Tab-separated table of C-alpha atoms (C1' of nucleotides) in Angstrom:
chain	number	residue	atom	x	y	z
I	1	UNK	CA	0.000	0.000	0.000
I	2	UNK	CA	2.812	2.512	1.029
I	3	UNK	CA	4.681	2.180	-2.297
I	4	UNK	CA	1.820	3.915	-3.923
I	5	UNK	CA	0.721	5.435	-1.430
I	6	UNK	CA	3.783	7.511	-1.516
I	7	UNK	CA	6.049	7.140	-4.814
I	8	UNK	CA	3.183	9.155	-7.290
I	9	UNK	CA	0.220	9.606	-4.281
I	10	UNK	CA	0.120	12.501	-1.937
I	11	UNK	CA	3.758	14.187	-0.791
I	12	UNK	CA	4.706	17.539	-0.269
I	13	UNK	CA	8.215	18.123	-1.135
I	14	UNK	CA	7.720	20.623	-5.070
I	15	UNK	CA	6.275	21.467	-8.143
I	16	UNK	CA	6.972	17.852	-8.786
I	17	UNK	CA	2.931	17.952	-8.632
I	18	UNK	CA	2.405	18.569	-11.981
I	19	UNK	CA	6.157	17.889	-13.432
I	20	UNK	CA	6.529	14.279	-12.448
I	21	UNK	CA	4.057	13.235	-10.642
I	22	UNK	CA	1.377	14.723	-13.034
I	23	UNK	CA	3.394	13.168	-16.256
I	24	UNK	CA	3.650	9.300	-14.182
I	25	UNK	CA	0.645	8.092	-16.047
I	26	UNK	CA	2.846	6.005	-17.994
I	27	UNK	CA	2.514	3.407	-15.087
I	28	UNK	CA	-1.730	3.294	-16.172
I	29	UNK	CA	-1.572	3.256	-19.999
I	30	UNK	CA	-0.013	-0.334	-19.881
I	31	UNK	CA	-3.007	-1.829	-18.350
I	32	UNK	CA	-6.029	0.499	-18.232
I	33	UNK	CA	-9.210	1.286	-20.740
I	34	UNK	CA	-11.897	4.102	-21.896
I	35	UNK	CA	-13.061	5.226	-24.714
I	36	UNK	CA	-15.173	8.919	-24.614
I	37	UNK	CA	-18.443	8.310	-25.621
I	38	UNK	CA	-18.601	12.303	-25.876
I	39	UNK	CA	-17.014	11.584	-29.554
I	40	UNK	CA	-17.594	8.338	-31.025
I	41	UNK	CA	-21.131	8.642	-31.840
I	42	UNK	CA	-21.937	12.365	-31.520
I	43	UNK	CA	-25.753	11.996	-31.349
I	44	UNK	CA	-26.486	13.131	-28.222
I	45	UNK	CA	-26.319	16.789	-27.166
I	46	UNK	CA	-24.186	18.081	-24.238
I	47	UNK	CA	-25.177	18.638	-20.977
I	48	UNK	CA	-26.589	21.889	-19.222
I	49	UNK	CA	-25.464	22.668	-15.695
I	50	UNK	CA	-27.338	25.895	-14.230
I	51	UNK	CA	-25.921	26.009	-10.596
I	52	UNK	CA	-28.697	28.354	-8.521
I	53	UNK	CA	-27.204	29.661	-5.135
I	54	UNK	CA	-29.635	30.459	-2.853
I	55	UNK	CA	-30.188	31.947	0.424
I	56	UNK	CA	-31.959	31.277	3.655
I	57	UNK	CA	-35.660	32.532	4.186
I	58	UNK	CA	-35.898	33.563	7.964
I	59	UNK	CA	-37.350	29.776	9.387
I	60	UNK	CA	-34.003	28.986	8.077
I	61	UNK	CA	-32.208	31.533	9.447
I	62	UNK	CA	-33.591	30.782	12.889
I	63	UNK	CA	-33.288	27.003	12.144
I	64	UNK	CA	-29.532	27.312	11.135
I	65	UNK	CA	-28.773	29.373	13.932
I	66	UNK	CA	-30.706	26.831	16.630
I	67	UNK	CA	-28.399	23.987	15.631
I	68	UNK	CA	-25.644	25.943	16.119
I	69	UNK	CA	-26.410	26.406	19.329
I	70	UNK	CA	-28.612	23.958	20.124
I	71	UNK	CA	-32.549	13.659	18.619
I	72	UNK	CA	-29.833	15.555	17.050
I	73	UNK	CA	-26.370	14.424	16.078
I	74	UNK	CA	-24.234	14.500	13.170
I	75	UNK	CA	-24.611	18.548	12.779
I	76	UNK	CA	-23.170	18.439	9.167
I	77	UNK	CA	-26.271	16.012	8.341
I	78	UNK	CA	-28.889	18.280	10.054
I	79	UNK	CA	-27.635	21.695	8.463
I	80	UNK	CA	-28.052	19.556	4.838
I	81	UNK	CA	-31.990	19.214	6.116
I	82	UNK	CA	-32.402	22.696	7.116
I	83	UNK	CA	-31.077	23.678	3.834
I	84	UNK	CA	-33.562	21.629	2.118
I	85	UNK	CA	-36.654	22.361	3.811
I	86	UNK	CA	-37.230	22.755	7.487
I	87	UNK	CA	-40.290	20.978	7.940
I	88	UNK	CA	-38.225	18.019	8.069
I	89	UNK	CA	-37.618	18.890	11.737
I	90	UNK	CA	-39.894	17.633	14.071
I	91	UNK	CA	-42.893	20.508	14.801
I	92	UNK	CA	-41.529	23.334	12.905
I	93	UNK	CA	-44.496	23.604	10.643
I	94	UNK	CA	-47.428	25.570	11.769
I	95	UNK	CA	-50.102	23.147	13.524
I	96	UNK	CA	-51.870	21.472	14.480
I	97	UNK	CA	-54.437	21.287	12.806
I	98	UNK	CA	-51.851	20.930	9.584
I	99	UNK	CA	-52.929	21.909	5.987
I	100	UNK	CA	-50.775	22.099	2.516
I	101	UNK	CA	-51.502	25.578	1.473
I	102	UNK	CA	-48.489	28.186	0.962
I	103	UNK	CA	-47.476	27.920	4.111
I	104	UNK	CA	-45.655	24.845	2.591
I	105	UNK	CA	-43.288	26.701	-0.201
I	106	UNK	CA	-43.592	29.910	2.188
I	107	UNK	CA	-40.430	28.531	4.581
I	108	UNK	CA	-37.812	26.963	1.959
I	109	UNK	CA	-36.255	29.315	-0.148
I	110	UNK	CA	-35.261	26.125	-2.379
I	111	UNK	CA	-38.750	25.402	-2.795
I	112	UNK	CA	-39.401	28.505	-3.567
I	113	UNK	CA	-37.163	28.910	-6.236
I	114	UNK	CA	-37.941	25.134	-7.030
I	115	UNK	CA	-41.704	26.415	-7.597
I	116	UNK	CA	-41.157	29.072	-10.170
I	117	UNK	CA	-39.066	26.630	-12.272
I	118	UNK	CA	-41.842	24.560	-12.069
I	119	UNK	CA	-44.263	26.618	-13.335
I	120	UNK	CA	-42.016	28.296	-15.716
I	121	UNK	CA	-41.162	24.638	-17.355
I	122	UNK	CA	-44.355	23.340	-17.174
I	123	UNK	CA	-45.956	26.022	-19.614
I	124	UNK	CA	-42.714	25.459	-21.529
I	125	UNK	CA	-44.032	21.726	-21.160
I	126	UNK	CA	-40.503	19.949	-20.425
I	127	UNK	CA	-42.067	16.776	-17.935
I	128	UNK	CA	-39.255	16.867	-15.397
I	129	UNK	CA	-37.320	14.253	-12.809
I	130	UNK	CA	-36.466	15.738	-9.453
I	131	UNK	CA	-33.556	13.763	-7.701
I	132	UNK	CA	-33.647	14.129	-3.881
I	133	UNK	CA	-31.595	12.426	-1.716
I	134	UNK	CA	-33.620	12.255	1.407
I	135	UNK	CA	-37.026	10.100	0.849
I	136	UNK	CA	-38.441	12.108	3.982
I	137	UNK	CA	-37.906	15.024	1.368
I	138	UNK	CA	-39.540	12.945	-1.205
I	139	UNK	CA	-42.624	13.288	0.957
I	140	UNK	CA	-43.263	17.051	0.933
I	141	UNK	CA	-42.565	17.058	-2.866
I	142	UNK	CA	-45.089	14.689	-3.167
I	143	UNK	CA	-47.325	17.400	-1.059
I	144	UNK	CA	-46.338	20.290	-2.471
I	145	UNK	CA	-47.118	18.450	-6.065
I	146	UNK	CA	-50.507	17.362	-4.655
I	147	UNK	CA	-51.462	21.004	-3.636
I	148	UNK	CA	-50.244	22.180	-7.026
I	149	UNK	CA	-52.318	19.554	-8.925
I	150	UNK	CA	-49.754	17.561	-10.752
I	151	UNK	CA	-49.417	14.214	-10.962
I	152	UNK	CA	-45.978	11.785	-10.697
I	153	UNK	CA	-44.928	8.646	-9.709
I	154	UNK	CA	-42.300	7.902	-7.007
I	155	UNK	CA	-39.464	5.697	-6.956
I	156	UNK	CA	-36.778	5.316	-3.818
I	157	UNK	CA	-35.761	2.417	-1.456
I	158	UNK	CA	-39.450	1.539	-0.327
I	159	UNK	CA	-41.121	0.990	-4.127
I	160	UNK	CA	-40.838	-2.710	-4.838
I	161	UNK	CA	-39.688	-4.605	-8.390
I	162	UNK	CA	-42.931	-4.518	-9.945
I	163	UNK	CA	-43.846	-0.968	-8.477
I	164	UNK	CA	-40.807	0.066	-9.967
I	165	UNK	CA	-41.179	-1.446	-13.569
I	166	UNK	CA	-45.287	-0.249	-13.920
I	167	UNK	CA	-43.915	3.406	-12.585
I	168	UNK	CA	-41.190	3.255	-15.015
I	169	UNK	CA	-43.628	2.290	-17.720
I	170	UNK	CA	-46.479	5.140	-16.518
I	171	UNK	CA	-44.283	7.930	-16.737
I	172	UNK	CA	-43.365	6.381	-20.611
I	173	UNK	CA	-46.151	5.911	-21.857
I	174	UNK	CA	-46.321	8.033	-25.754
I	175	UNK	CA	-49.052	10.293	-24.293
I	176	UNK	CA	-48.540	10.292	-20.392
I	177	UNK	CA	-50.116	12.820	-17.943
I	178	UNK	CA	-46.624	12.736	-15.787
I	179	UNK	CA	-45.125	16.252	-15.622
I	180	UNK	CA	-43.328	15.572	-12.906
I	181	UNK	CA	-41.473	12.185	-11.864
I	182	UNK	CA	-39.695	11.960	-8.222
I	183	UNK	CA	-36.485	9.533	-7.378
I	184	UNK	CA	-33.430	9.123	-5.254
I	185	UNK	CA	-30.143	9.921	-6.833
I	186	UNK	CA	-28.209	6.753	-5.761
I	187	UNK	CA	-31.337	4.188	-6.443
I	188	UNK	CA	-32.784	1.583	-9.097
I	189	UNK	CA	-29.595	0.668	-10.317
I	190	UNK	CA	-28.493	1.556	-13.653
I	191	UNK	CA	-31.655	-0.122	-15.910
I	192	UNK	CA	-33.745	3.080	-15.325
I	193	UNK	CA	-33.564	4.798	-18.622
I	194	UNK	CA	-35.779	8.236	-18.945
I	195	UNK	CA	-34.575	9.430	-22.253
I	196	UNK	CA	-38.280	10.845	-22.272
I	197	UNK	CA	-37.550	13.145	-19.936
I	198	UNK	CA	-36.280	16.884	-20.155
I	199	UNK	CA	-34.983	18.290	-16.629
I	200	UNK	CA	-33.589	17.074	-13.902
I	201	UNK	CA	-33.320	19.357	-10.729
I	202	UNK	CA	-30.769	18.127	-8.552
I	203	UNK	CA	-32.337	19.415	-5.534
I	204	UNK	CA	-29.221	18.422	-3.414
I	205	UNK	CA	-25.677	17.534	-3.911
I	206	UNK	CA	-23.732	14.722	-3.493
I	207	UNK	CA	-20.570	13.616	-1.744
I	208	UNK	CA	-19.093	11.397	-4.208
I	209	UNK	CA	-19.654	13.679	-8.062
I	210	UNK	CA	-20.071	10.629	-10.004
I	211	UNK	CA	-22.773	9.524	-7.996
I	212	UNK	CA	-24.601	12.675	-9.240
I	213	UNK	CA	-23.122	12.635	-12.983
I	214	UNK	CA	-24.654	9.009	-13.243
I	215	UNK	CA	-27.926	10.025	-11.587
I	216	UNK	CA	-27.869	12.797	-14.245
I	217	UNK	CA	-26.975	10.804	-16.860
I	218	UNK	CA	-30.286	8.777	-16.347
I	219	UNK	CA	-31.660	11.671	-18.660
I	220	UNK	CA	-28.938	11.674	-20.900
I	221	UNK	CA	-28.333	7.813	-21.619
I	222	UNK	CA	-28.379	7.018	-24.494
I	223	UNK	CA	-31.762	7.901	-26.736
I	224	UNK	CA	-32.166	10.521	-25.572
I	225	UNK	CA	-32.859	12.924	-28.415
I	226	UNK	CA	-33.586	17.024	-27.492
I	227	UNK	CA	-31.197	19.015	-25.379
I	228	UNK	CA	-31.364	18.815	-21.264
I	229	UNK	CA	-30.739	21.363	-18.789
I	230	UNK	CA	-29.907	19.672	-15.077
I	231	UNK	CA	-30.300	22.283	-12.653
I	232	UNK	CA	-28.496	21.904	-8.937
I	233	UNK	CA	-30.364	24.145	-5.916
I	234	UNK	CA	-27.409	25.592	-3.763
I	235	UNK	CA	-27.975	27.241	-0.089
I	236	UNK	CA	-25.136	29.953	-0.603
I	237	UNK	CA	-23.510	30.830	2.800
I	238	UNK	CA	-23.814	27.262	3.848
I	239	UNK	CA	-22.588	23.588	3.977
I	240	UNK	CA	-23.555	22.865	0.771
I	241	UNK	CA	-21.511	25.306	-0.262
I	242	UNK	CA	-18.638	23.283	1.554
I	243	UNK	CA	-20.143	20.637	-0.025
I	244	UNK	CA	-19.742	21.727	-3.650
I	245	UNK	CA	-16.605	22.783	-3.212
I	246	UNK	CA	-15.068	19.445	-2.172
I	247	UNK	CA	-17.122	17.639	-4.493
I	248	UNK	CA	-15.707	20.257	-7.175
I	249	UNK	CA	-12.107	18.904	-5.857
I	250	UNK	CA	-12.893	14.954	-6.404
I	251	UNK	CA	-14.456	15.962	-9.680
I	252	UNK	CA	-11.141	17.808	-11.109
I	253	UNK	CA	-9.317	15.087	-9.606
I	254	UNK	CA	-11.092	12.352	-12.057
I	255	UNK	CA	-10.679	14.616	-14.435
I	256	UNK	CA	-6.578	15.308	-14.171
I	257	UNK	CA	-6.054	11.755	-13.257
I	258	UNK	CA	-7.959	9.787	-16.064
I	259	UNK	CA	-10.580	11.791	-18.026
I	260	UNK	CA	-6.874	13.763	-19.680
I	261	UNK	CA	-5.336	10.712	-20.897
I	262	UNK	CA	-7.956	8.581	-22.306
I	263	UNK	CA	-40.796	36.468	-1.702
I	264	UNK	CA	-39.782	35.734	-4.410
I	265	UNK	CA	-35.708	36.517	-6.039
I	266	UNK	CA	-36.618	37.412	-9.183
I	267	UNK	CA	-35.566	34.082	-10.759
I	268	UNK	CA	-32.948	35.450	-13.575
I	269	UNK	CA	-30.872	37.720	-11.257
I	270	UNK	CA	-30.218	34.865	-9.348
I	271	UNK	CA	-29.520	32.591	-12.045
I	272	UNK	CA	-26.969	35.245	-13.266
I	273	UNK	CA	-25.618	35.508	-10.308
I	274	UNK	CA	-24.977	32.135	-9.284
I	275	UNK	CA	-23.184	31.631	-12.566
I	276	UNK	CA	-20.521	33.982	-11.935
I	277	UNK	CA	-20.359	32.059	-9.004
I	278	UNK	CA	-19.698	28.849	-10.444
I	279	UNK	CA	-17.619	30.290	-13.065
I	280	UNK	CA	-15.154	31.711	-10.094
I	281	UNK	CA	-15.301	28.873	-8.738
I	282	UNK	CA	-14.071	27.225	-11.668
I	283	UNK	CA	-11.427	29.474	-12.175
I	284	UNK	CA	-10.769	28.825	-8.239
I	285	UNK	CA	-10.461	25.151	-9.130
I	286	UNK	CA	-8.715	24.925	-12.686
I	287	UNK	CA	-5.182	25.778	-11.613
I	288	UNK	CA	-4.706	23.445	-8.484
I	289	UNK	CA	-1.869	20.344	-8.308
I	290	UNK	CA	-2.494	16.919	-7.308
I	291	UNK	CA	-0.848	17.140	-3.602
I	292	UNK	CA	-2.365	20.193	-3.750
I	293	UNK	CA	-6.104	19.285	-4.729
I	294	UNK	CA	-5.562	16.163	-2.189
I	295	UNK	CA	-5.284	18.316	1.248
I	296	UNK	CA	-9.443	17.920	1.780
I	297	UNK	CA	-8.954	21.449	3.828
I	298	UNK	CA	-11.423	20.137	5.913
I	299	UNK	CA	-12.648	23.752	7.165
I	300	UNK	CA	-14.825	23.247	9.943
I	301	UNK	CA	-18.408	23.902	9.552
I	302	UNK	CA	-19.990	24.283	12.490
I	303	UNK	CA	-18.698	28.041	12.458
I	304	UNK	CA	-20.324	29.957	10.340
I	305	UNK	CA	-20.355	33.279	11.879
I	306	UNK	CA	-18.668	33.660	14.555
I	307	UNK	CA	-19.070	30.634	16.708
I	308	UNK	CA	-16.936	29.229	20.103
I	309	UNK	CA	-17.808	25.584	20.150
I	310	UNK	CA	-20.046	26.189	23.013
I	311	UNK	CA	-23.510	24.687	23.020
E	1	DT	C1'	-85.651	-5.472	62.644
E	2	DC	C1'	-84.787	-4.730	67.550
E	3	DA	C1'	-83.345	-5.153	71.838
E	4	DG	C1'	-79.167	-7.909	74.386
E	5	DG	C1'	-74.536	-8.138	74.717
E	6	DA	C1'	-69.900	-7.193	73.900
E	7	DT	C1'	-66.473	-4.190	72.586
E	8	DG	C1'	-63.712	-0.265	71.556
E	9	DT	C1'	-63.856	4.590	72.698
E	10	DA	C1'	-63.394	9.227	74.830
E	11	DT	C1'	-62.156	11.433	79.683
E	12	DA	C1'	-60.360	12.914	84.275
E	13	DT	C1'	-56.479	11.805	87.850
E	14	DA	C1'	-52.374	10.495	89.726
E	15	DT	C1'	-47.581	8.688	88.807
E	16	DC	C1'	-43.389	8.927	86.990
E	17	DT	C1'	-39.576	8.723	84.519
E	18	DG	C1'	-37.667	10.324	80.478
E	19	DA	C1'	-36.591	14.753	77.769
E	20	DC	C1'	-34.604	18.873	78.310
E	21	DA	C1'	-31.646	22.775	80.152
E	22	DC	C1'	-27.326	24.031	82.323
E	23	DG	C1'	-22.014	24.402	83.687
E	24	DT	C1'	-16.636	22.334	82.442
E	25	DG	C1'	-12.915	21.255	80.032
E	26	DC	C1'	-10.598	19.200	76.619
E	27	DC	C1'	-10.186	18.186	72.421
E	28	DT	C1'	-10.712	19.124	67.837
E	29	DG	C1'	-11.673	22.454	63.970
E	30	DG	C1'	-9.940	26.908	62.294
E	31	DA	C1'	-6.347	30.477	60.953
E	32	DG	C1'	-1.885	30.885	58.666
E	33	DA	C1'	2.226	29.847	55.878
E	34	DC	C1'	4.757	26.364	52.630
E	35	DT	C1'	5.003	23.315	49.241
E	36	DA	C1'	4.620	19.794	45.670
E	37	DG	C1'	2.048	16.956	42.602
E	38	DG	C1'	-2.580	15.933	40.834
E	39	DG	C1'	-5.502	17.595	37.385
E	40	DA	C1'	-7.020	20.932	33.689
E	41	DG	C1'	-5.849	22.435	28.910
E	42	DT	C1'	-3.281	21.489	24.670
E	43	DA	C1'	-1.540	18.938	20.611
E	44	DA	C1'	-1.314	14.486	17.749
E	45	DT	C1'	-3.307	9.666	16.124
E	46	DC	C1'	-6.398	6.226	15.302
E	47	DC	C1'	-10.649	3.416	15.839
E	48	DC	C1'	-15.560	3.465	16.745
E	49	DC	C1'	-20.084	5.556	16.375
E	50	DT	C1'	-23.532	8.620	14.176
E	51	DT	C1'	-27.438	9.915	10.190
E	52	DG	C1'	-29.502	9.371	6.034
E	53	DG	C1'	-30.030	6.370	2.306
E	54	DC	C1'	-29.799	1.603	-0.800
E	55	DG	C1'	-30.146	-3.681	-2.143
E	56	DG	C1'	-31.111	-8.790	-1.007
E	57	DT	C1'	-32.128	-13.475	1.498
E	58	DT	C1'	-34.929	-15.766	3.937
E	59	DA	C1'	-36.672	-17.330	8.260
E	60	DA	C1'	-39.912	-15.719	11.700
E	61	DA	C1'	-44.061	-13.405	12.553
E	62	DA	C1'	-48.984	-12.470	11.543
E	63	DC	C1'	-53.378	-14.511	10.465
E	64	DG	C1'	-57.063	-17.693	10.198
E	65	DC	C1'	-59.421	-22.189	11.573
E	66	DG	C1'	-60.848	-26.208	13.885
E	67	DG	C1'	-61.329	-28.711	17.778
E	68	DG	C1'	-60.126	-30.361	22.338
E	69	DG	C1'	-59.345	-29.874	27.007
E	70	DG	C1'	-58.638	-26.847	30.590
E	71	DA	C1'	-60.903	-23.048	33.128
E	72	DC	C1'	-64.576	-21.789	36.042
E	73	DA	C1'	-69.521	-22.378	37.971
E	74	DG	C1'	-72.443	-25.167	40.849
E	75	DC	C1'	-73.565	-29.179	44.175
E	76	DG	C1'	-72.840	-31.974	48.219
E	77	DC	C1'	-70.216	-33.248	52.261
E	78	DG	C1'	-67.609	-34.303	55.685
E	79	DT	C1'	-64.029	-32.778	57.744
E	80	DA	C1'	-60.996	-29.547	60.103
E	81	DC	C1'	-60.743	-25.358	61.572
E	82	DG	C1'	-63.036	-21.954	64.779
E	83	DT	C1'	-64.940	-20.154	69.389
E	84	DG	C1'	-65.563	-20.655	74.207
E	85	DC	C1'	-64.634	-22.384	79.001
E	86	DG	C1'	-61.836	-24.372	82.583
E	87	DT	C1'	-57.286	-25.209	84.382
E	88	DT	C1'	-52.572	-25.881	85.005
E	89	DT	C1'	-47.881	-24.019	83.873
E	90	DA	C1'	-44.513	-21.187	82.760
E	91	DA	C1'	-42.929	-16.308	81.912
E	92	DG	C1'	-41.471	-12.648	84.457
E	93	DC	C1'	-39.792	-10.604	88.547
E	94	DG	C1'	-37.221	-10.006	92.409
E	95	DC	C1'	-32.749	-11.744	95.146
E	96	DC	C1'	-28.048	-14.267	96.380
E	97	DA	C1'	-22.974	-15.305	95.751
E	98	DA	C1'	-18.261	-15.373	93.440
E	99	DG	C1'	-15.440	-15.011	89.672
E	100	DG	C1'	-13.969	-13.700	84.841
E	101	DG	C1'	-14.563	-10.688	80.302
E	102	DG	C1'	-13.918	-6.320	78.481
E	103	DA	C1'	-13.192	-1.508	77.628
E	104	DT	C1'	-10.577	2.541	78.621
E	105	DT	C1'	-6.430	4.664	80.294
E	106	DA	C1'	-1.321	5.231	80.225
E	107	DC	C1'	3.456	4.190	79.108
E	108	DT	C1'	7.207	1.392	76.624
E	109	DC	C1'	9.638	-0.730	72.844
E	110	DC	C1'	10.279	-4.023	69.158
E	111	DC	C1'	9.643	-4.857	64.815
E	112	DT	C1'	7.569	-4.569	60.807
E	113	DA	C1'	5.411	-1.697	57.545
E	114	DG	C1'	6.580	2.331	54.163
E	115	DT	C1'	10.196	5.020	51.246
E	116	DC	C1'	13.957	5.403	48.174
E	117	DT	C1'	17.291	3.298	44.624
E	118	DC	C1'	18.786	0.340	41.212
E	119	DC	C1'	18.171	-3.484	38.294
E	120	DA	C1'	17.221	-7.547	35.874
E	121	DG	C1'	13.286	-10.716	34.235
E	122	DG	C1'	7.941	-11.329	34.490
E	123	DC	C1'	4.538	-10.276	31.382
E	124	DA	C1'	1.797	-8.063	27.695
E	125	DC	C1'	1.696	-7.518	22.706
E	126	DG	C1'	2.261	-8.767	18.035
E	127	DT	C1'	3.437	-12.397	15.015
E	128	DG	C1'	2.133	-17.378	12.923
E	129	DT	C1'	-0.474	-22.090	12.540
E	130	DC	C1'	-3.374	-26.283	13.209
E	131	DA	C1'	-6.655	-28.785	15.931
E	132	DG	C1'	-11.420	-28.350	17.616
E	133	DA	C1'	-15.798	-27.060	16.548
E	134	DT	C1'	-18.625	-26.477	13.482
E	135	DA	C1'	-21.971	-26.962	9.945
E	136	DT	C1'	-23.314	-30.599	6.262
E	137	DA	C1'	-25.622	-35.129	4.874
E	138	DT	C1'	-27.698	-40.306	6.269
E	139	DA	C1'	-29.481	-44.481	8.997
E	140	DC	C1'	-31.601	-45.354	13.029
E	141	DA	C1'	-33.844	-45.982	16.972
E	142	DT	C1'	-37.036	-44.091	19.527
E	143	DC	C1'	-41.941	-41.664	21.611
E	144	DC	C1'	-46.702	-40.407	19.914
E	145	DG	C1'	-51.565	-40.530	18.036
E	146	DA	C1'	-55.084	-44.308	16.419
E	147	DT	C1'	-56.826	-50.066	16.780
DNA sequence: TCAGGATGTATATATCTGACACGTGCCTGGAGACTAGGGAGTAATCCCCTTGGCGGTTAAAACGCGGGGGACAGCGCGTACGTGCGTTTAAGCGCCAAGGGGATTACTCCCTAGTCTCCAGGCACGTGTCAGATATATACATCCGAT
């Protein structure tokens, strides 16, 4: 383990990061394979990433602030739900007795967002997939898609085979009512194919970046024939801002290692905004080395403000 | 049911003996230095535990049904407990005798512990293995529900 581990993996000693180290794939080439489907059919049309950064409403705000300083472990987890949505947590909604009407979208500034997309694509008429990653989230989509009179079908870790197979077929039919069509990013395998479809809104991000670029790629598998646009909700001035950024790093990392040597916020303000975010970020990104890009700065989270590790 | 008994149940009085208040001294808790080592805070490392989610195998768990036998209700009945009365008998209470047992109370010493100072050699930890305990199958002999 050490050998590699330490003769091309992680040192710090120069600019051997991208002079030697970098240039060592010549111990891969021997024995490893690829071959880009990007450009060896060319019939499918590139991807669409539309990064939206978004910021707390004020249940949010107080939420956020209430786990800093507060069942509850594994903070990092918990500031992922309140980022989401916060009725997740136990009794934050208004009630009882408990109803569905704006009060729902009127405490997640995701949702929010989330619901003029929505509407805006659904009198475009693009039928869209919506990957969560909690299937407690699942559950207020389904809600909030009740209350807005649409109709989907739901797939995650509690659907069985033949659930799974009739929804599949449902939302394919050649003239099916199914605007919108819920999942979980890392579930059902790889068989799912939903060339049919149009959008997928990453409503949260993912540790590992593949696990998202395959869930995204359920879209864009091969078949599919019109253009997609995946969008990805981030809380800006948050984890999941943390959580982009190292995700960012592993992605790069693929990239250098292999992939080289084969109220409302006035939706477009914010969409401009957040992408000259991302591009920054980018540019943040591009120029790092491989010892470099490995450090995982592992900046600590739970301050966020100004914080003292006290309760 | 009601009047006839039997039994607690309040009530006033006198007795007493046990709780309480009071002075002494002697012993222990408090004030006051002096000091050293236990513990709080810090840094580094690694293994375990969290939260949310997914996929799969496959025995247990849930459900329904039918039928028996165990439960619970009655009916005698014939004891074996109760209640009451008479009468011994023993518990308790005093008293006699002389000792030994024991618990302070106050010196003495011996000797046997604690303390320190090196210093080897017991033991805990990290390495192999191979022998015992598995799970498998099969043949058997051995209880259980109907004549």
């Amino acid at each position: 383990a050490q050998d590699f581990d330490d003769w091309f993996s992680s040192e710090s000693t120069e600019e051997d990061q991208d002079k030697i180290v970098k240039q060592l794939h010549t111990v891969l080439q021997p024995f490893l394979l690829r071959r880009i489907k990007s450009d060896v059919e060319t019939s499918l049309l590139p991807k669409k990433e539309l990064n939206l950064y978004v910021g707390m409403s004020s249940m949010q705000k107080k939420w956020y602030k209430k786990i800093l300083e507060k069942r509850l472990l594994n903070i990092m987890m918990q500031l992922r739900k309140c980022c989401n949505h916060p009725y997740l947590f136990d009794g934050a909604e208004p009630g009882p007795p408990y109803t569905t009407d704006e009060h729902l979208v009127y405490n997640a500034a995701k949702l929010q967002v989330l619901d003029k997309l929505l509407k805006k694509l659904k009198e475009e008429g693009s039928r869209v997939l919506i990957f969560s990653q909690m299937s407690r989230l699942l559950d207020i989509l389904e809600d909030y898609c009740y209350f807005r009179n649409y109709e989907y079908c739901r797939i995650d870790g509690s659907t069985a085979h033949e659930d799974r197979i009739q929804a599949i077929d449902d939302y394919n039919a050649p003239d099916s009512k199914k605007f919108v069509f819920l999942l979980t990013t890392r579930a059902g395998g790889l068989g799912i194919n939903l060339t049919s479809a149009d959008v997928v809104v990453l409503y949260d991000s993912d540790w590992n970046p593949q696990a998202d670029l395959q869930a995204m790629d359920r879209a864009h598998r091969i078949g599919q024939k019109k253009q997609v646009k995946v969008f990805r909700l981030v809380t800006d001035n948050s984890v999941e801002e943390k959580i982009l950024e190292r995700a960012t790093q592993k992605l790069r990392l693929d990239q250098l290692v292999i992939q080289q040597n084969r109220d409302d916020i006035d939706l477009d303000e914010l969409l401009l905004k957040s992408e000259n975010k991302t591009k920054s970020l980018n540019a943040k990104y591009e120029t790092l080395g491989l010892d470099d890009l490995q450090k995982f700065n592992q900046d600590s989270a739970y301050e966020w403000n100004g914080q003292d590790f006290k309760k």
